[PDB]
Design a binder for this molecule. Sequence first.
Ligand SMILES: N=C(N)NCCCC[C@H](N)C(=O)O
Length: 336
Amino acid sequence: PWSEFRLTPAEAAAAAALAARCAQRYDETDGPEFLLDAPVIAHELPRRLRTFMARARLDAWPHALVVRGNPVDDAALGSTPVHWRTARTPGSRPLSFLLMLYAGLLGDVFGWATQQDGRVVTDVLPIKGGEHTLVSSSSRQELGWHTEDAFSPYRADYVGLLSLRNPDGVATTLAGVPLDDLDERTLDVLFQERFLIRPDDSHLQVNNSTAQQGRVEFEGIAQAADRPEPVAILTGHRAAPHLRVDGDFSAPAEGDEEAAAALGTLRKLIDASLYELVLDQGDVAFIDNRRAVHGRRAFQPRYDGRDRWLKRINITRDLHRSRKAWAGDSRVLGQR
Ligand SMILES: N=C(N)NCCCC[C@H](N)C(=O)O
């Protein structure tokens, strides 16, 4: 149910060399200079990869684009960080550049003023003490399926994930719209503005650095949690709908029992059709955040220096869509 590409060793080496050159010439991935240049530098990537990315983005069916075979040397990478705060390590640096180059072929990268301190390239790794939370640094508790940043109209079109290491083969989960099982009445209701979707816990002050917790953009998050506006779960074409839902942060509109039944049914059908994608070391996935929800299976964290670790990036097809929320400015979204 996804589109897959495997780099030849020569293609993988060339992409890696390009990323290393970028890491040599630019101070950081999230600086204005590399943010502007990366999409044009990405034109230098191996042609067969550029062809795959251009065409697979235009296919109607895939839930994700997956690129296999980027080499990662665990000795050069170093230990998995204890927290995302300290995760911009020299060993991970070139792979962060690599992810952004790949992302530049699909759209405009951006971050949130209220998530991981406004970073564009973010980290997914288990944090000691946070095993049973609702954020991506969880482990022992499964990360429930979700549209990334479901609460926001400016949420990503694609979510990029690059596996730095995943020694125990922990699966990312995915599901599309269960169109084979949704009856027309239920479908009709899911297309109506009868649902509430609150921001997830990654946007809370407690999950950002103490220095950031006075930022005005947390006000907007509070407003969205306290007074969510009713929206639709499904949009667009009835035979191939786009999806906006989060299994732990969605609810029906107040007292709307038909909407509740529709969401209840959708939960069961998504639970039933959820499938696994294992991102091995060096694998990159770009998840279609309109066609699919995603999550991550429960796993026992190691905390020994070799935990599963991904770099992540949010991608939009059009940054100008979010101008009302430009905060840091165009590339870091948030509102009062
Ligand atoms: N059903 C759940 N858990 N929803 C929230 C998922 C985590 C989202 C957030 N971007 C993060 O990286 O933590």
